[PDB]
């Protein structure tokens, strides 16, 4: 379950392949925001005095079913698990016992 | 309605058939009578049926 | 105690009332004797008289859903001494 702050890799979409870091999250709607992917060029500030000096381009939310969590050793996307080795739960990798 | 103090004698209901067997609801009341009976507390005017009144009653 | 809710700062409550005539907006189930006591305990003044009037709810937003605003109760205190009821 992708949390804000970690490194991911796109699995599907126009930017298949690229890798970034998660800067936001819409958990009620399952949307993460990845730096670099899904750039939308927008017409902003019809009247509002910024002043309008062009076009502000930002990211766009993507569905959390399109990113995967890379393995800290082989540089490979994978799934996750919960070993429960600490009194608190712990997230571990799948293609290896190492952690995230 | 009126009802007998000692026993619940009450009005019934039925037909009043004619010789050509036509029907019409009527009522059959009870023979109640105002009498004063000697209830331990007081003698108070109550209704008692004229059949209850036979075979003795404190009047 | 605190029966008052909020002062009223509008035209006709700004100058010709400015002098010894302060408008307050109070609770809808109090009499005028109670306001003559709450104003003296909160501000430490001497009150000459109090008048009161009630307003009826209005129709609010014609567009979309329709509805009524609240009913309010407007009081007016006159000071025989002192000043500074609102700043």
């Amino acid at each position: 379950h992708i949390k804000k702050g970690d490194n991911v890799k796109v699995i599907a979409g126009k930017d298949k392949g690229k890798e970034g870091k998660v800067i936001a999250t819409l958990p009620k709607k399952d949307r993460v925001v990845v730096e670099g992917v899904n750039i939308m060029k927008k017409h902003q500030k019809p009247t509002q005095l910024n002043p309008e000096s062009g076009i502000l381009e930002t990211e766009a939310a993507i569905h959390v079913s399109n990113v995967q969590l890379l393995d800290p050793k082989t540089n490979e996307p994978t799934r996750v698990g919960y070993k429960f080795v600490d009194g608190k739960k712990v997230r571990i990798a799948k293609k290896s016992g190492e952690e995230i | 309605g009126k009802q007998c103090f000692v026993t619940g004698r009450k009005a019934s209901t039925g037909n009043r058939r004619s010789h050509a067997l036509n029907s019409t609801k009527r009522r059959w009341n009870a023979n109640l009578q105002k009498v004063r009976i000697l209830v331990d507390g007081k003698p108070k005017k109550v209704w008692v049926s004229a059949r209850a009144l036979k075979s003795g009653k404190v009047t | 105690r605190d029966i008052l809710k909020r002062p009223v700062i509008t035209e006709k409550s700004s100058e010709a009332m400015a002098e010894d005539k302060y408008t307050f907006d109070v609770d809808t189930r109090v009499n005028k004797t109670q306001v003559k006591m709450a104003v003296e305990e909160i501000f430490n003044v001497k009150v000459a008289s109090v008048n009161i009037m009630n307003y009826k709810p209005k129709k609010k937003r014609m567009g979309r859903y329709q509805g009524y605003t609240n009913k309010r109760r407007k009081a007016i205190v006159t000071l025989k001494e002192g000043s500074d009821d609102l700043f």
Binding site: - | - | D2, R6, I9
Partner: protein, 58 residues
């Protein structure tokens, strides 16, 4: 939570909160002197938190 004090102190606190931080912070939201408007909810909740504790003692 701010109700760690003894019984008399608790009785004073409620008057202190409601007679200063609620009445005064609403003669400014009306005339237009108040900013940092989130102070109102905090005062309102504190009084609720106080009474709830007083009552439990009964």
């Amino acid at each position: 939570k701010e109700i760690r004090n003894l019984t008399t102190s608790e009785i004073e606190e409620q008057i202190k909160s409601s007679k200063e931080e609620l009445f005064n912070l609403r003669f400014q939201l009306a005339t237009g002197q108040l900013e940092e408007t989130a102070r109102i909810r905090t005062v309102r909740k504190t009084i609720a938190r106080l009474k709830t504790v007083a009552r439990e003692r009964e």
